[PDB]
Structures are given as C-alpha cells and as structure tokens.
Amino acid sequence: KVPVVGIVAALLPEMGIGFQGNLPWRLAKEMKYFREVTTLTNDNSKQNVVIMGRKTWESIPQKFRPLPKRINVVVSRSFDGELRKVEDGIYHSNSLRNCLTALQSSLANENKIERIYIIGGGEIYRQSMDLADHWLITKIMPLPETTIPQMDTFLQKQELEQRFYDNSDKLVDFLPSSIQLEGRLTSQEWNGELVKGLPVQEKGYQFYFTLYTKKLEHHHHHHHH
C-alpha cells in the first residue's frame, strides 16, 4: 500500500551506475535531488524508508550514514532476520523481499511511512524490477567534450523497458510538493533514443530527472477463496 520506488542515477546509453564500489561521477545537483526526494514527504508526520545493499551501505561515507531523516535498511545474506533494529535509524535485514513485506505492515509501520525508496546496489536493482511500482532515474549523458567514465555495474535497461514506460510527464506531480526544480520538461534525442525529463547540467554532464511507471497489466487472474 506504500509505493515502492527505485531511485538511481544511470549513464546513457548502457545505464552504468558504478565502478569499483563507488559512483563514476560526483554531481552535487544530482545528490541534492536524491537527498530531497528521499528525505521529503507530503505528510509532515511521516518519513520515507531507504533500502540498500550491504556494499552500497559500505560505500557511503561514515559521516553521512545512516542517511538522516530517513529510515535506513541495509540488506545482507549474513544478517539475522527480516527486519531488525540494530542502531538508531538503522535496520538490518537478510532478505530484500521479506523486509518489504515487513515494512508494508500497517500494524508495524503505523501508517507513518510515506514511501519506500530502493536506493541501490546493482545487485539490489536487479531484484527490484518486479518489486518497484516506479523508477526515478536520472539519465546522465556525457557532454560532447566529456570523457565517458569507466563503469562495471549497470541498470537492467531491458527489464526496465519490458515492465515500465516513460512517465516523465508526471514527474513533477509525483515528487513531494515542496521540491522545486530548475528545469522544465524537455524531450531530447540522444544517440538515437528519446530522453524526456527535467534537464540539468553540471560539470561535464547533462542529466535528466525522469519517472518510469509500471505498464498496464492484463487481468488474467484474481485470487478468490
């Protein structure tokens, strides 16, 4: 009942997201968007959750973790159970799927979680294609003069486009109300593909904030007792 939203910054056209345990770029305006989207809520009494792979947790600078004003969940196969408080603002879980079921319990959550953000790991993102209701994808393009950075971790663009459609016309409505963005909705062609979203430029890169939403599903079966 609480929306599950994958959120990621990916470099076009291969949708690379990482290299050697870290990000392949440093974009302050991209980080600002991420922080504000995942932190801010429409209901002032709720917080959002951020779920992440263990390797992604270990990549966040120790001073900035756990991410403030969000419930942090770190998933590891070596952790103890489905959703355990281990420190203030930190839950541990040995199962991505089970922790989500756990977080969706209104008895447990008191309807005080507004959104569940899946904030990554390539490995986590691979398993979230069937879990997420939406994807917030920052589509990043190196500007003409910019060197394409080396990358070893990738978003599954095939799986994304099988299950989700580009819903960027609804990005602004979809973001928490208090967020303000510098750009206006733009449609640009880039290396053959349509890039639609809210444009930003920083350092050697042009990027678009986009929103992907699950495709309409046929009604094949509804479980009756």
Binder to ligand 06V among 54, 60, 167, 202 (CB under 6 A)? Answer: 60
Specify the residue, 49 or 124, whose C-beta has the smaller distance to ligand NDP: 124
Q: Which entry of ligand 06V, ligand NDP, none binds 60, CB below 5 to 8 A by partner kind?
A: ligand 06V
Contact at 8 Å (CB) between 4 and 213? no
Q: Which entry of ligand NDP, ligand 06V, none binds 94, CB below 5 to 8 A by partner kind?
A: ligand NDP
Specify the residue, 53 or 199, whose C-beta has the smaller distance to ligand NDP: 53
| Residues within the interface to ligand NDP (CB under 6 A) | 8-9, 17-18, 21-23, 53-56, 59, 75-78, 94-96, 119-124, 127, 153
59 binds ligand 06V (CB under 6 A): yes
Cα separation, 26 vs 39, whole angstroms: 20
Concatenated DSSP letters of the chain: -PPEEEEEEEETTTTEEEBTTB-S---HHHHHHHHHHHH--SSTT-EEEEEEEHHHHHHS-TTS-SPTTEEEEEE-TTSSSSSEEEETTEEEES-HHHHHHHHT-HHHHTT-EEEEEEEE-HHHHHHHTTT-SEEEEEEEEE-TTSPPPP--EE--HHHHHHHEEE-GGGHHHHS-TT---SS--EEEEETTEEEEEEEEEETTEEEEEEEEEEPP---------
Q: Which entry of ligand NDP, ligand 06V, none binds 210, CB below 5 to 8 A by partner kind?
A: none
107 is catalytic: no
145 is catalytic: no
Window of 30-38, 75-83, 178-186, 215-223 that interacts with ligand 06V by CB under 6 A: 30-38
Q: How far is the CB of 209 from ligand NDP (least distance, A)?
A: 12
Q: Is 10 known to sit in a ligand binding site?
A: no
Name the one residue in this structure whose structure tokens are 């989500």. 100
As annotated, the active-site residues are 23, 30
Binding residues (CB under 6 A) for ligand 06V: these are 7-9, 22-23, 30-31, 34, 52, 56, 59-61, 64, 67, 119-120, 138
Binding-site residue positions = 9, 17, 22, 54-56, 76-77, 96, 121-124, 127
